[PDB]
Amino acid sequence: SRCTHLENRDFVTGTQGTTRVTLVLELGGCVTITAEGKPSMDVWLDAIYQENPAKTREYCLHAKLSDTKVAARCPTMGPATLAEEHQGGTVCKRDQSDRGWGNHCGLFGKGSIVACVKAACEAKKKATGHVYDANKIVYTVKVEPHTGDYVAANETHSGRKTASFTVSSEKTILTMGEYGDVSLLCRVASGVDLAQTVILELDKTVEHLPTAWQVHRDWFNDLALPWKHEGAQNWNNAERLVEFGAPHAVKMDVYNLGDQTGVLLKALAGVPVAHIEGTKYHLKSGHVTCEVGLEKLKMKGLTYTMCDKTKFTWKRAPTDSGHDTVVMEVTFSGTKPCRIPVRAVAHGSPDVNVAMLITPNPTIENNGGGFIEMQLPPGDNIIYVGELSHQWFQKGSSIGRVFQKTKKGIERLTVIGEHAWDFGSAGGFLSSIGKAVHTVLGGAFNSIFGGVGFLPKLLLGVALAWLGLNMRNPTMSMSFLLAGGLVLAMTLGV
Amino acid sequence: SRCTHLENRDFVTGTQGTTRVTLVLELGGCVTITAEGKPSMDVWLDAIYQENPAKTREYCLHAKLSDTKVAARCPTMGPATLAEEHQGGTVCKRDQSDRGWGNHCGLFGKGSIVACVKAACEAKKKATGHVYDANKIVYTVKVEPHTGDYVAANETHSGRKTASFTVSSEKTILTMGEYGDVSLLCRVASGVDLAQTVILELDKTVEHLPTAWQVHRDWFNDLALPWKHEGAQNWNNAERLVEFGAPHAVKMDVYNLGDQTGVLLKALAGVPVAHIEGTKYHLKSGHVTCEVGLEKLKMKGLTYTMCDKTKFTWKRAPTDSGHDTVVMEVTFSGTKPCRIPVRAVAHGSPDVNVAMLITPNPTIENNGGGFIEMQLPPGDNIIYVGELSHQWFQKGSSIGRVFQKTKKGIERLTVIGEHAWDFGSAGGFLSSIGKAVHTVLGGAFNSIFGGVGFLPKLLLGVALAWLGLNMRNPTMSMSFLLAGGLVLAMTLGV
Amino acid sequence: SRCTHLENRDFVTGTQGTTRVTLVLELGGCVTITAEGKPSMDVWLDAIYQENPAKTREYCLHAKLSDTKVAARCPTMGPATLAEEHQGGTVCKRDQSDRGWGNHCGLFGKGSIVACVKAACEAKKKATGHVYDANKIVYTVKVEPHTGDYVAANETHSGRKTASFTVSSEKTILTMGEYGDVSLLCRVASGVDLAQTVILELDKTVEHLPTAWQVHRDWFNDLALPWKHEGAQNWNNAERLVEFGAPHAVKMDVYNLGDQTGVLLKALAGVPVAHIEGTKYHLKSGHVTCEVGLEKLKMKGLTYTMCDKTKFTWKRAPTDSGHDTVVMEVTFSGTKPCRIPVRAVAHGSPDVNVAMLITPNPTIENNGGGFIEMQLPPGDNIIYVGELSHQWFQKGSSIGRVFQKTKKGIERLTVIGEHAWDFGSAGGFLSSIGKAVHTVLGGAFNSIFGGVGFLPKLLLGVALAWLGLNMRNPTMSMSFLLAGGLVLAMTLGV
Amino acid sequence: SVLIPSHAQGELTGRGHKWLEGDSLRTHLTRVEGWVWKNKLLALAMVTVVWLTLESVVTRVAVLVVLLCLAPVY
Amino acid sequence: SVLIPSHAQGELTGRGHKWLEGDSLRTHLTRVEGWVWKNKLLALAMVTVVWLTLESVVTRVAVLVVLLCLAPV
Amino acid sequence: SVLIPSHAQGELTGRGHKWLEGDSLRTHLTRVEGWVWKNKLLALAMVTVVWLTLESVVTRVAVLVVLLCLAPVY
């Protein structure tokens, strides 16, 4: 199946007789959902995108200057003036210069000078920003059944099915041939917080650069650069990129601060990448919450006869997948449609079959089948397929597996936030309480420290720790210690 | 007299029997030399320059990339190898990436991948540094006789003379006609410290940007940018502008950090400007110490007859100068060669003459003119030229003049350091002790706090004052408090 | 019985309540398994080998240098460069040399110099590292019926049978002629850790050196020599063998540090030897845990009648074995097929028979005489074969036998480690507890002191003891001293 | 990443034109002001906690100054 | 002059490709360690001054930590 | 086994070219500093144990010097 390809994968099992299971799909991830007597499914989120989003204020990065003009008058007459000073698209400065008989004034002292220039952004040095509309965003989810066949990453799997969700059409049914029907419910209101994300374009034909960035809205609105809205002809605040030198008697210099691209791209350091492929603007990082209903699923070939035990052969020997699972591929030559008798035996025990199969009831069929994936307990084991056999030392330990999965859980919690509590739960009391406590505490923490640097956050944590330790009474001492500990813990964890 | 065209004018007065005087000549400044019985002189420094200076290593600011190549190998088949990795002009990086049956390999695990790209510098985006040679540098000093003519700043005075000093230059004499010879001896290598100055050229073609900068050598030699010398064909450390994304299974991306011109110009903020003219490289700052010999000067027209008291008229009425002096110009009708009778009296005391002329023995000549410059005491005065009379209120006060001179002395100390103790000095203990104490104290302070910066230096001053407060014993407590206060005061004043 | 040919031998007895037994066979060892109701068997591990294993890395031991180049530049100019600096297979260095008029330099000071040389390796002076593949390794086990005939070490015994275990193999049945069938299950990948060992090949055709060595992977990765992979053309880090002298004005010398084979062979002191045979790579140390099933083995010739007691004669009079047994050979001339009446009696009691026979039931047949190996208690005894008789004195004592077995046990435990608890194991508390505790404590100790030398280990032990004597009041002092003693003892006892 | 450090101020002097106005205490205070408006809630929190907990006026003033100066640069 | 402030680190996250590695604990530990190894003499001078002057273990730890963090300025 | 001892350094001197630089006090101190930087944690462990168990400053200095000098070889 597809989700053996990724570094990131997860497993969830429906408890005895459960009809549906809830998931949070993370873009660039996978979940394998399994239940007794139900065919195993791979479910993942493939794309989040919109066509021609809305625009927002557009910045400039490299100014082009023209028609420099200057005027000045002597040390006792009225201030100088230029017509361009009242027009649009011009930047001007007013200053005083020293003059005297040396340059044809009648008196010695401070005369007046004014300079003006015309400013327009260079051809391809704009920075456009876009925002998504919740009424138009498309989420695409894909589902794949565990047939007994394997296909590479550049090959078309015949069982792949697609469901596209908008704010309308929140629920869909997918039909999967012999395996039956599966139900998907995915409300977009639970997904990415669209109010706070902006897509930043720069120039998309520049090779060796990403096509777009996913910057934060508050950060985007604070940049000190020239800017305008779409269609307008005259830039606001060319002053930020045009600077003036000190004046001579009757002349004054206009300087251009140059292209800012290198400063901008250094500021964007930590921002996630986004993509553009035409009319379509893709996020490459996000998540959705869904409920999957399994009741309409059914097994294939459950009534077949067993294979001829002597006919099997390996096409690929068993190998470790890196997810604590073993993968195998078998070939067969007897009467074609039949059921494979795979099993595995632990050393030092009476031949009990201990394998847990991810692909249930494997079959061989006309021009298909043969792939197997299974989990074995730690230690020395033997694998049997009919008369064919192989050996396997399963590395690791039970406590190691528990720790590994706990670490994965902590990582998910810190990456997805409050929505992590909805992963794989049967709903109810524990999950609801966890989510409520998490959200109410996180809101306050985000309110007090949103946008602050990691170093100042750590520094305040240390200060609070010291001050609580030094506090004059126990209650306040503990309160300050707890506050410092909380800020330190969260800053170090994130 | 050119000295009237600028602020920063300095008056130096000798005494009868003074053979010669020492001056520190600065760009954008000038001195008028007055003597008890000899014509006044104008002396100033016009240019410090070299022709075709020697180069130093060039830096790139906008990388051009081409012909990316990528290769990879499976988790057990050893590291990847690519032909271009050993050539020149190429940037390469090798890393590990995940593999598995999803890709066309035998095992699941970390493989090897390597990527390379040809790097160059774009057509006109290279900063280049030049350094001066002490045996070729040229200083130009100019001297003007201070005749009674007046000439605008865009027009050439027929009497001024030029001295082009080099390391191979002796004491030189300038004739300047009837006024007699004047002598100059300028000590090259007494001025700008050429061992730590670099002229930075960015692109002399662009319109709205200064043509050169005078950066510090200790700052120029450490700079995170690709660099090479003039004759080399391939760049070193091109890896400073290219970046590489996290690898996929069989691909990884090459990124370009763009043009750095805007961050460079931001760093150069405080640097002084320089200039380029064809083959000539000019500084626009610096100073040189030079001795001027007045020995062979003579006054003109000493044997001429006195002009008629009548037959004068004004051409420009008396007006206030920028330097607390009065300037005027008169016309005469009659037999031309003669001496102007000029005097001034306090209102209500015609017996005493209070004028101090900057132009001794004013004359009118067959084709000359009647420019005059005077200093008068504060208050109400009358100016007489023959029988022409004019009233004049002289603003200011004696305390104000003393204050102005003291302030300018402080500024010269701030600008040229210990060399200030040589300005206009006849020698002796004041100059000797001042220069010795200044050089030693300044050397120590520069050794400790040379490159630390204003606000960090001020903060350390505050810390030192706090330490002096904290130290328990009163006497060194106070001494250290005084030390902290002194460092604070000096770092704030400079 | 091949067990007689070797210095090292071990006996294991199956009590009648058992039919399968656990062995850990050691390459170069040998074991006799016997049960009162079954014919005895000789089983040993013959070889561990692979064909054409993988190549990890290759080092070079004698650099070849060619086409030296050098260039220099004067102080006032940019550093020198050579094209060889940007090519494959070259090593280069740049430095500063003093120059002046004496070298046509034009100015006194430090210039620049650069030198380069092409580097390769001599035809036969490479060193190749090979690694095994767990899915291709072969273990050979051999079993011998203990026929009662005898043959020397350079002769082939008709009853000897072979088994070639691999990961593919499972429990195998060997048929042994009239004696029946025996079952073997060997657990490949439970023996030597293939992830830690590298087979190091220096050269095949040197007449007076071993063909291969076995070395540890952590050591082999840090050999600090020039290194490469098969098929790659240019060496990495030839700078480790080329060395550069200090420069003259315009010359620099390149030195070669020569052959390293001597220092390598001196560093390898203490590692096990390996072997190479055509395409096969053999280890010469290692072990395999196996379970051997004795059911369906049956006696030979129980139906025969007893021999003519008067006809026997000696062919090889009784002799003392190396393993505390007696060995003899008889000849007979009567009706050939018949059982040998062999017995022995202690001198103090003429009624009780005392012999214990390793041969299960000796008989003579049309071909093959009578070899007998038997055990007797310490003291004076008489051996009878029918009328033929001989007199024997058995050295040692029961206490000595117990002590010698204890020595054997300790030695095996020290050599093989954890697997010692499986030798002759049939489950049970003592065996299980021993293996568990040994695993835990041995792993803990190894993680701390793995790879550390004996002298540092002894010094740490002594220092810990001394610091315990020097330690503060609380009782934990004794534990500190005990820790030092423990590390010292565990270092000394091995 | 390319990291060009800002040129030192006091080592070079003259009377010709300078490229731009250098960094200064007024600039520092202006930047602090710009930061405070965006982070007012945390500003009030930091001022109130120290003003309440510490005992001496001068010490509180010093700590406030140090905190404000340190806040924006990172 | 125009100042484009650096983007906040933890406000926005996920599992896609990031642009470049932003300032983090690892980076700052590396910076302080390298700086100390660059300014050894000064580092030991400050450390010993504080350790000698300040009276209590916890306050010495706090002051040393803060100073080492701020040292690169 | 053949074991050629390292030539003594202090017994010969001159101003001509030497074959290859040998050991010296500064070289050993360089190796000590490099080792300490490589194994920071172990260095602090060794320092703290003795700082806690030995009361006399001179004794601590002596033991620390001995341990540091022996560290690179072991």
PDB file of N, CA and C in Angstrom, chain C residues 17-50:
ATOM      1  N   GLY C  17      14.990 -39.454  30.747  1.00  0.00           N
ATOM      2  CA  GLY C  17      13.723 -38.751  30.655  1.00  0.00           C
ATOM      3  C   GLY C  17      13.686 -37.683  29.579  1.00  0.00           C
ATOM      4  N   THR C  18      14.708 -37.638  28.725  1.00  0.00           N
ATOM      5  CA  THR C  18      14.845 -36.600  27.713  1.00  0.00           C
ATOM      6  C   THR C  18      15.209 -37.224  26.372  1.00  0.00           C
ATOM      7  N   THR C  19      14.832 -36.536  25.286  1.00  0.00           N
ATOM      8  CA  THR C  19      15.108 -37.016  23.938  1.00  0.00           C
ATOM      9  C   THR C  19      15.726 -35.961  23.028  1.00  0.00           C
ATOM     10  N   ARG C  20      15.759 -34.696  23.443  1.00  0.00           N
ATOM     11  CA  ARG C  20      16.394 -33.628  22.684  1.00  0.00           C
ATOM     12  C   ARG C  20      17.290 -32.832  23.618  1.00  0.00           C
ATOM     13  N   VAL C  21      18.389 -32.304  23.078  1.00  0.00           N
ATOM     14  CA  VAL C  21      19.356 -31.586  23.904  1.00  0.00           C
ATOM     15  C   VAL C  21      19.858 -30.343  23.180  1.00  0.00           C
ATOM     16  N   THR C  22      20.225 -29.335  23.974  1.00  0.00           N
ATOM     17  CA  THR C  22      20.681 -28.040  23.485  1.00  0.00           C
ATOM     18  C   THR C  22      22.203 -27.985  23.518  1.00  0.00           C
ATOM     19  N   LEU C  23      22.805 -27.595  22.400  1.00  0.00           N
ATOM     20  CA  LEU C  23      24.242 -27.422  22.277  1.00  0.00           C
ATOM     21  C   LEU C  23      24.540 -26.009  21.796  1.00  0.00           C
ATOM     22  N   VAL C  24      25.728 -25.513  22.122  1.00  0.00           N
ATOM     23  CA  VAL C  24      26.288 -24.346  21.450  1.00  0.00           C
ATOM     24  C   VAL C  24      27.636 -24.776  20.889  1.00  0.00           C
ATOM     25  N   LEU C  25      27.667 -25.051  19.591  1.00  0.00           N
ATOM     26  CA  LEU C  25      28.875 -25.525  18.939  1.00  0.00           C
ATOM     27  C   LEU C  25      29.821 -24.364  18.682  1.00  0.00           C
ATOM     28  N   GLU C  26      31.105 -24.602  18.929  1.00  0.00           N
ATOM     29  CA  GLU C  26      32.153 -23.606  18.752  1.00  0.00           C
ATOM     30  C   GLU C  26      33.087 -24.059  17.644  1.00  0.00           C
ATOM     31  N   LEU C  27      33.391 -23.157  16.720  1.00  0.00           N
ATOM     32  CA  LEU C  27      34.311 -23.482  15.643  1.00  0.00           C
ATOM     33  C   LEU C  27      35.678 -23.771  16.248  1.00  0.00           C
ATOM     34  N   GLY C  28      36.223 -24.950  15.956  1.00  0.00           N
ATOM     35  CA  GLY C  28      37.433 -25.424  16.594  1.00  0.00           C
ATOM     36  C   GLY C  28      37.219 -26.241  17.853  1.00  0.00           C
ATOM     37  N   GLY C  29      35.984 -26.347  18.344  1.00  0.00           N
ATOM     38  CA  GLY C  29      35.662 -27.199  19.467  1.00  0.00           C
ATOM     39  C   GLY C  29      35.128 -28.546  19.010  1.00  0.00           C
ATOM     40  N   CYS C  30      34.627 -29.320  19.972  1.00  0.00           N
ATOM     41  CA  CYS C  30      34.023 -30.594  19.601  1.00  0.00           C
ATOM     42  C   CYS C  30      33.274 -31.172  20.798  1.00  0.00           C
ATOM     43  N   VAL C  31      32.157 -31.843  20.514  1.00  0.00           N
ATOM     44  CA  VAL C  31      31.248 -32.327  21.549  1.00  0.00           C
ATOM     45  C   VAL C  31      30.817 -33.758  21.254  1.00  0.00           C
ATOM     46  N   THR C  32      30.783 -34.586  22.300  1.00  0.00           N
ATOM     47  CA  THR C  32      30.170 -35.908  22.269  1.00  0.00           C
ATOM     48  C   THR C  32      28.890 -35.874  23.093  1.00  0.00           C
ATOM     49  N   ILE C  33      27.779 -36.252  22.471  1.00  0.00           N
ATOM     50  CA  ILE C  33      26.486 -36.346  23.134  1.00  0.00           C
ATOM     51  C   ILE C  33      26.154 -37.820  23.286  1.00  0.00           C
ATOM     52  N   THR C  34      25.751 -38.223  24.489  1.00  0.00           N
ATOM     53  CA  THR C  34      25.442 -39.630  24.697  1.00  0.00           C
ATOM     54  C   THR C  34      24.254 -39.778  25.634  1.00  0.00           C
ATOM     55  N   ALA C  35      23.443 -40.796  25.364  1.00  0.00           N
ATOM     56  CA  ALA C  35      22.317 -41.153  26.210  1.00  0.00           C
ATOM     57  C   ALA C  35      22.335 -42.660  26.391  1.00  0.00           C
ATOM     58  N   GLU C  36      21.976 -43.111  27.592  1.00  0.00           N
ATOM     59  CA  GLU C  36      22.140 -44.522  27.914  1.00  0.00           C
ATOM     60  C   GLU C  36      21.392 -45.414  26.931  1.00  0.00           C
ATOM     61  N   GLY C  37      20.206 -45.000  26.503  1.00  0.00           N
ATOM     62  CA  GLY C  37      19.411 -45.797  25.596  1.00  0.00           C
ATOM     63  C   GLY C  37      19.701 -45.630  24.125  1.00  0.00           C
ATOM     64  N   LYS C  38      20.657 -44.796  23.739  1.00  0.00           N
ATOM     65  CA  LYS C  38      20.881 -44.454  22.344  1.00  0.00           C
ATOM     66  C   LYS C  38      22.348 -44.612  21.984  1.00  0.00           C
ATOM     67  N   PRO C  39      22.654 -44.853  20.709  1.00  0.00           N
ATOM     68  CA  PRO C  39      24.052 -44.807  20.274  1.00  0.00           C
ATOM     69  C   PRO C  39      24.598 -43.392  20.375  1.00  0.00           C
ATOM     70  N   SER C  40      25.861 -43.283  20.772  1.00  0.00           N
ATOM     71  CA  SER C  40      26.488 -41.981  20.933  1.00  0.00           C
ATOM     72  C   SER C  40      26.855 -41.386  19.579  1.00  0.00           C
ATOM     73  N   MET C  41      26.954 -40.056  19.541  1.00  0.00           N
ATOM     74  CA  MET C  41      27.177 -39.313  18.309  1.00  0.00           C
ATOM     75  C   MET C  41      28.275 -38.281  18.512  1.00  0.00           C
ATOM     76  N   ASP C  42      29.015 -37.964  17.449  1.00  0.00           N
ATOM     77  CA  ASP C  42      29.998 -36.886  17.490  1.00  0.00           C
ATOM     78  C   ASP C  42      29.582 -35.776  16.533  1.00  0.00           C
ATOM     79  N   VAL C  43      29.374 -34.569  17.055  1.00  0.00           N
ATOM     80  CA  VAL C  43      28.858 -33.459  16.259  1.00  0.00           C
ATOM     81  C   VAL C  43      29.765 -32.251  16.437  1.00  0.00           C
ATOM     82  N   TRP C  44      30.090 -31.578  15.332  1.00  0.00           N
ATOM     83  CA  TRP C  44      30.941 -30.397  15.424  1.00  0.00           C
ATOM     84  C   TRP C  44      30.648 -29.410  14.302  1.00  0.00           C
ATOM     85  N   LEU C  45      30.950 -28.142  14.581  1.00  0.00           N
ATOM     86  CA  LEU C  45      30.777 -27.040  13.638  1.00  0.00           C
ATOM     87  C   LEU C  45      32.038 -26.926  12.795  1.00  0.00           C
ATOM     88  N   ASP C  46      31.907 -27.128  11.485  1.00  0.00           N
ATOM     89  CA  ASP C  46      33.073 -27.199  10.616  1.00  0.00           C
ATOM     90  C   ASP C  46      33.463 -25.856  10.007  1.00  0.00           C
ATOM     91  N   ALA C  47      32.502 -25.037   9.582  1.00  0.00           N
ATOM     92  CA  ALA C  47      32.876 -23.821   8.874  1.00  0.00           C
ATOM     93  C   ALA C  47      31.753 -22.794   8.902  1.00  0.00           C
ATOM     94  N   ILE C  48      32.158 -21.527   8.919  1.00  0.00           N
ATOM     95  CA  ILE C  48      31.276 -20.378   8.743  1.00  0.00           C
ATOM     96  C   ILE C  48      31.844 -19.585   7.581  1.00  0.00           C
ATOM     97  N   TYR C  49      31.073 -19.449   6.503  1.00  0.00           N
ATOM     98  CA  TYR C  49      31.652 -18.828   5.322  1.00  0.00           C
ATOM     99  C   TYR C  49      30.598 -18.189   4.433  1.00  0.00           C
ATOM    100  N   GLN C  50      31.085 -17.314   3.554  1.00  0.00           N
ATOM    101  CA  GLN C  50      30.254 -16.693   2.529  1.00  0.00           C
ATOM    102  C   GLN C  50      31.036 -16.617   1.227  1.00  0.00           C
TER     103      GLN C  50
END
